């Protein structure tokens, strides 16, 4: 894990950090959720033409069986597993993860 876990940072800062125009699309980081306490979040930068650079945020909910998920069909025992999976194939994500955000 490590590289990509940014800790307790705000939605505002993650966007500030992901909207850097030299970041490739699919740059990401995992933070804590400001809105839902106990849940994390995956902030991916995307580039739609017309809207320009933007950031999609996905909430990673945890189950008491000890697994994380964004969707329920796919569950992971580990947030590092989740990152690995979404790096290999987007499978619903706006873009597969390609890059651990700089800092």
């Amino acid at each position: 894990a490590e590289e990509w876990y940014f800790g307790k940072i705000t939605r505002r800062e993650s966007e500030r950090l992901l909207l850097n125009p030299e970041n490739p699309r699919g740059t990401f980081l995992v933070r804590e959720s400001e809105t839902t306490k106990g849940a994390y979040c995956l902030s991916v930068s995307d580039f739609d033409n017309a809207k320009g650079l933007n950031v999609k945020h996905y909430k990673i909910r945890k189950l008491d069986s000890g697994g994380f998920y964004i969707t329920s069909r796919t569950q992971f025992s580990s947030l590092q597993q989740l990152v690995a999976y979404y790096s290999k194939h987007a499978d619903g994500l706006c873009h597969r993860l390609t890059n651990v955000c700089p800092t």
């Binding site: 979040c41 945020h57 996905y58 909430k59 964004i70 969707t71 619903g92």
Partner: peptide, 7 residues
Amino acid sequence: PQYEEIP
């Protein structure tokens, strides 16, 4: 705040 959901 809005969050994306996988469809």
